[PDB]
């Protein structure tokens, strides 16, 4: 039984590999060599935030490109006004080690979590004005890595227990749970349709789960090391994955394989975040070399470098409209570039 | 300048006041990371340091300064990822069952893994060989010998510069010093001075438990201020 099942699994893996190789008519480079060059993208710092106390370990852009949520390792969430630089909201968290934060698409709820294994969603438009604990949901036997809002009543979360889960705000329980991975899930990324979302874990693989049914429609198994960041393409047909090997990989849902591997010899420090622009040409990724890079999703050439920070960059995010890009590092300073 | 913008600026200034008031305490605090397997007596240590939650924070004041010890015993076995967030902490207290020789190998493996970590490379790792009475009773009974697990224990001579405590049997002293020597060898390996180990023999009832944390963190901060300020 066990031996027959192992042999069948190996045969299925070999068949999937052969099918993926057959569809690999050519690499993205051969087709992205005719497109005109993107040139150097020299982004300058337009804003400088000096409110955070501890290492910034999360960030996200809500429906409005003016408010920016950022979480610090001291258990503090801060909603900044990107334009005026003012502090729109300050939320003290009961958990000091917060590693994830997201801004609901309605601008009324903000999620957070971390080593506490309890996802806390606070409401910003409460009649009482002050920030109140809207839903402190638990059930995951592991640290929370990332959070993303799907609507004003549901929220997807990934925990260190290797299992992601979509919870309901009103009910405060798992609307659905996905099968466990081989390692701890470290990042999440929602698709523009909100129906599917791809997630990577410590294991060198990324699974594309569905919100309707708890099943990974696709499972890419192409990485050197532990994936630490993942981002969805603005269209929803591809997605970038970044690990600690200092190499990003752009996988495709239609082709079901890697398109181009963004890597360089002079870059040896791992990656911590990945993000795209409103168009997708500029792929932004923060590296452990105390800086961020911006490559061409098509040409794969180094388009820009951001070395304003002084500590290891922790997270970065592009606005929904693409006017600027926020970057939070361990230097307790968040910088907006444009 | 609009009035709403001025009110928002005033609210931001108040939030900055509060953030500075909190950062004062933050900077003035000392974060400690308690690590240890299930067999380790970390629970007994937390119970003694009284001067689905994957994190447990415990604040205790010693010599008029606070210490926030963080225990993590409700998470998955592997800890190569969530351990990175605990950088820049004051110290790391590793617990090990010095009496149970069976789990000593896994304890040393975990200690070496936590020491050679790339992110915690510059973080000191304090060591409390808890459960000393059990180890003494075991080595005195003679039913369990460390030689069965470690052959070097058969060809290991008692340190000449040792400091046997009053009333300790030669076998107990030799065993504890061999354990300490093994730990110091595993620590100094690729240490480079940026981080050094602090082993201390902790009993199960010794009230002078947080005092060890204080004395270790004092030297840790002393070396950190000698290095950063270019005096060593």
């Amino acid at each position, epitope marked *: 039984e066990l031996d027959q099942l192992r042999q069948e699994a190996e045969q299925l893996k070999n068949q999937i590999r052969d099918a993926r190789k057959a569809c690999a008519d050519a690499t993205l480079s051969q087709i992205t060599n005719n497109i005109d060059p993107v040139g150097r993208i020299q982004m300058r710092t337009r804003r400088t935030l000096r409110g955070h106390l501890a290492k910034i370990y999360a960030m996200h852009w809500g429906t*409005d490109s003016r408010l920016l949520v950022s979480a610090s390792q001291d258990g503090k969430l801060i909603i900044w006004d990107s334009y005026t630089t003012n502090k*729109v*909201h300050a939320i003290p968290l009961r958990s000091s080690w917060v590693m994830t934060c997201a801004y609901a698409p309605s601008g009324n709820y903000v999620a957070c979590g971390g080593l506490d294994n309890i996802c806390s969603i606070y409401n910003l438009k409460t009649r009482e004005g002050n920030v109140r604990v809207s839903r402190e949901l638990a059930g995951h036997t592991g640290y929370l890595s990332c959070c993303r809002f799907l609507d004003d009543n549901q929220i997807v979360t990934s925990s260190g227990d290797t299992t992601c889960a979509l919870w309901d705000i009103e009910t405060g329980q798992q609307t659905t749970t996905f099968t466990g991975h081989t390692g701890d899930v470290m990042s999440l990324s929602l698709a523009p349709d909100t129906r599917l979302f791809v997630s990577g874990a410590c294991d060198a693989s990324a699974k594309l789960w569905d919100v309707r049914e708890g099943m990974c429609r696709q499972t890419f198994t192409g990485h050197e090391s532990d994936i630490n960041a993942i981002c969805f393409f603005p269209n929803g047909n591809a997605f970038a994955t970044g690990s600690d090997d200092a190499t990003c990989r752009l996988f495709d849902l239609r082709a079901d394989q890697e398109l181009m591997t963004y890597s360089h010899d002079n870059i040896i420090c791992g990656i911590t975040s990945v993000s795209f622009s409103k168009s997708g040409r500029l792929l932004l990724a923060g590296y452990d070399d105390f800086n961020c890079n911006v490559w061409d999703a098509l040409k794969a050439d180094r388009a820009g470098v951001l070395a304003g920070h002084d500590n290891r960059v922790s997270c970065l995010g592009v606005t929904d409209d693409g006017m600027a890009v926020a970057t939070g590092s361990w230097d307790s300073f968040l910088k907006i570039w444009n | 300048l*609009s*009035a709403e913008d001025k*009110a*928002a600026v005033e609210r931001s200034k108040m939030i900055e006041k509060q953030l500075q008031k909190d950062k004062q305490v933050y900077r003035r605090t000392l974060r400690l990371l308690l690590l240890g397997a299930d067999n380790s007596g970390k629970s007994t240590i937390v119970k003694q340091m009284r001067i689905t939650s994957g994190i447990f924070e415990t604040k205790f004041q010693v010599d008029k300064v606070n210490f926030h010890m963080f225990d993590v015993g409700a998470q998955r076995d592997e800890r190569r990822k969530w351990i990175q967030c605990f950088n820049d902490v004051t110290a790391i207290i590793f617990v090990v069952d010095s009496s149970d020789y069976n789990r000593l190998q896994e304890a040393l493996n975990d200690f070496k893994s936590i020491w050679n970590n790339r992110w915690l490379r510059t973080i000191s790792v304090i060591l409390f060989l808890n459960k000393q009475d059990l180890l003494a009773e075991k080595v005195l009974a003679g039913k369990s010998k460390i030689e069965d697990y470690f052959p070097e224990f058969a060809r290991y001579t008692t340190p000449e510069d040792a400091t046997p405590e009053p009333g300790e049997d030669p076998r107990v002293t030799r065993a504890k010093y061999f354990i300490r020597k093994e730990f110091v060898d595993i620590s100094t390996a690729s240490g480079d001075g940026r981080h050094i180990c602090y082993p201390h023999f902790t009993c199960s009832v010794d009230t002078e438990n947080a005092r060890r944390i204080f004395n270790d963190c004092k030297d840790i901060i002393l070396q950190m201020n000698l290095r950063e300020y270019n005096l060593v």
Partner: single-chain antibody, 230 residues
Framework: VQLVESGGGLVQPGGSRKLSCSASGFAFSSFGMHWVRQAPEKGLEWVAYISSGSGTIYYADTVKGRFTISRDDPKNTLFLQMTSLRSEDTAMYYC??????????????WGQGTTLTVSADIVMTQATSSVPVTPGESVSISCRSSKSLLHSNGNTYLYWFLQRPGQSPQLLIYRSNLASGVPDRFSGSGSGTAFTLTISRLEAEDVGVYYCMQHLEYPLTFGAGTKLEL
């Protein structure tokens, strides 16, 4: 959320009085307070404003010197001490909460207020003061201003307050952006000079006085107010 005012009554000329306001159901310190007066058979008129933490205070050019506002945060209370009360001071005073930030709705909750009887800023002028209309039809109230409220930032500093018989003014619009707790029937349009409040379907609860307010500059000034009756 409640703002209970007290201290009103009859006062002789030249006297003094401390009007108190107890706030509950929210963080009193987080919301700036505004004392606004309404004369009998007339519209509203801003009096004083105190920011959070008492870091900033403002008064109207006509009320400076006499009235002084203060706030006790430990007790979540507001106080307004008036001295040398004149004959014109006869009016009903209301305490209003307002928090200022992107996406907020300043002046969202109006207190019940208390009546006290005796014995170059931007001006808002409305065309019509009373418009007869029955349920089922739509209403279009107009408003004119002497200075363009469109600031360089692009925010429309226009506030609409609906005061019903026996109730306090209720916020309808704070910036086209509908206010909280108000149905979608009310809408706002216009440029920085002219403004229009449109009600698509009238109801029995819509009868009342609609007042317009500008917030470009700290010194405020309410309009005459347009009345809608059955």
């Amino acid at each position: 959320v409640q703002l209970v005012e007290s201290g009103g009554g009859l006062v002789q000329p030249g006297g003094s009085r401390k009007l108190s306001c107890s706030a509950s159901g929210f963080a009193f310190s987080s919301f700036g307070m505004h004392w606004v007066r309404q004369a009998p058979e007339k519209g509203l008129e801003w009096v004083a404003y105190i920011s959070s933490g008492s870091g900033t205070i403002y008064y109207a050019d006509t009320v400076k010197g006499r009235f002084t506002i203060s706030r006790d945060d430990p007790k979540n209370t507001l106080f307004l001490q008036m001295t040398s009360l004149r004959s014109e001071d006869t009016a009903m005073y209301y305490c209003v909460r307002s928090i200022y930030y992107y996406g907020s709705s300043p002046f969202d909750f109006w207190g019940q207020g208390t009546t006290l009887t005796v014995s170059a800023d931007i001006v808002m002028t409305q065309a019509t003061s009373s418009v007869p209309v029955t349920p089922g039809e739509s209403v279009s109230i107009s408003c004119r201003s002497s200075k363009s409220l469109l600031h360089s930032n692009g925010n429309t500093y226009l506030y609409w307050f609906l005061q019903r018989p026996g109730q306090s003014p209720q916020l309808l619009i704070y910036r086209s952006n509908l206010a909280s707790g108000v149905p979608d029937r009310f809408s706002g349009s216009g440029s920085g000079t002219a403004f229009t409040l449109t009600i698509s379907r009238l109801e029995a609860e819509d009868v009342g006085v609609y007042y317009c307010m500008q917030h470009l500059e700290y010194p405020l000034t309410f309009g005459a107010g347009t009345k809608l009756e059955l």
